[PDB]
Nucleic acid binder design. Structure first.
Lengths: 68, 76
DNA sequence: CGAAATATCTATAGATATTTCG
DNA sequence: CGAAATATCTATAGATATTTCG
């Protein structure tokens, strides 16, 4: 539980709920690709929106990005 | 064998160490970007995410291989 | 099947804060 | 001093390759 989730695991968890990164981005008024940017770099707002969709805290998906 | 473990556990340079090493050579990320026809901020993007070309240009400026600055990004 | 989403490598920029330089 | 460079959080997009979905 100290390791960041793999990007494939985050995507799989969203898809199981009937949610896509693209759809979730569009639903929040962002460009389709914007939330997927959080898969490759630290982006607090995008992380918060993704975590919210999974009923999780962003620090539990990406503990290494929230060390401090 | 001993060589292979050491590759496997190598860690990425801290961004401050990369910047310090460039500056000691009289090079800035901004200057280096502009010198290659890129926007001033573009090479600094490699400090926050995997960007192979930017990594290559930065490593070249330090006389290094990008996989020695960012071993964790070049782990296959 | 084709459409859409994801993965990757490509390159970008506005606002704000801080540090370093000329 | 103001300019320039770096750091962070904000959000973006063209193209190719691959995977997943309806």
């Amino acid at each position: 539980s100290a390791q960041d989730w793999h990007r494939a695991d985050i995507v799989a968890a969203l898809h199981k709920r009937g949610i896509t990164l693209a759809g979730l981005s569009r639903a929040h008024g962002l460009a389709a690709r914007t939330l997927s940017n959080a898969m490759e770099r630290h982006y607090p707002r995008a992380e918060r929106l993704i975590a919210q969709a999974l009923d999780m805290r962003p620090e539990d998906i990406w503990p290494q990005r929230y060390r401090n």
